[PDB]
Design a protein around this nucleic acid. Structure first.
Lengths: 105, 67, 68
DNA sequence: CCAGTCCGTTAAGGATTGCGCCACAT
DNA sequence: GATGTGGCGCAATCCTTAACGGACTG
């Protein structure tokens, strides 16, 4: 409603979240969200897991990665979190997006 | 004068010359891409031949050695 | 929206950057394609030369089967 | 009720492309 | 003068990605 930030993330907000994860870890997403204005933990968690995490690779999708996704998807279906376990460095959301856009066609 | 007919006609004429100039350029690029598909096919074949003839030469050399 | 409102000039500036980028990417891709043809062509002349060499060799060998 | 996950869904914004305006080359 | 080219901008729309919201589960 009017007390929710649904816009962009400032380099400032990110850094606060990053520090928070190094402080307590990828937990208590509420706490850090409180210091932030207009944002709740769930958001901070998402922003971290998809963009702010260090292990999240940001490279282009390799030819080999596609294979795994096809093989896996034509066996499990839209089990993103599951297929993401076969793709080191990739997040469940990155697989979903890659499949619904590129691989979809 | 950007509204007369003289202007509209002058523009149309350059617009045609441009589409024409760009069809030529895009064509040159299309055949250049086909050349790649061609050469890539010819090289895969030539490499198969090289491997075939090498096996042949090897087998034959081994015949003269057992002589 | 207005063509004078800065909100427009900004949105246009971004597209103009993307357009110049996209047209530059395409111009590189074309140069590459042409370079790729130069390399395939050399590898092509090399492989053909190799085929001729192996054939000349096979022929030299089989000439030892000729008698009188 | 709250948190942590998982996912479908879709607005937001970069990437492409059809049409053209200019300036300058031939 | 006329046509040929290189560079760009505009605006429609193609393509991806971010992340909002709902459904579940502990």
């Amino acid at each position: 409603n009017p007390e929710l930030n649904k816009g962009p993330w400032t380099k400032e907000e990110d850094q606060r979240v990053i520090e928070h994860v190094q402080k307590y870890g990828p937990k208590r997403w509420s706490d850090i969200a409180k210091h932030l204005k207009g944002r709740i933990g769930k958001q901070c968690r998402e922003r971290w897991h998809n963009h702010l995490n260090p292990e999240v690779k940001k490279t282009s999708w390799t030819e080999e990665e596609d294979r795994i996704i096809y093989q896996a998807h034509k066996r499990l279906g839209n089990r993103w979190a599951e297929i993401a376990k076969l793709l080191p460095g990739r997040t469940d959301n990155a697989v979903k997006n890659h499949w619904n856009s590129t691989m979809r066609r | 004068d950007k509204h007369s007919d003289e202007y509209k006609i002058r523009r149309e004429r350059n617009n045609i010359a441009v589409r024409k100039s760009r069809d030529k350029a895009k064509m040159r690029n299309l055949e250049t891409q086909h050349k790649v598909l061609e050469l890539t096919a010819e090289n895969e074949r030539l490499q198969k031949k090289v491997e075939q003839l090498s096996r042949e030469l090897s087998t034959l050399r081994n015949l003269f050695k057992q002589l």
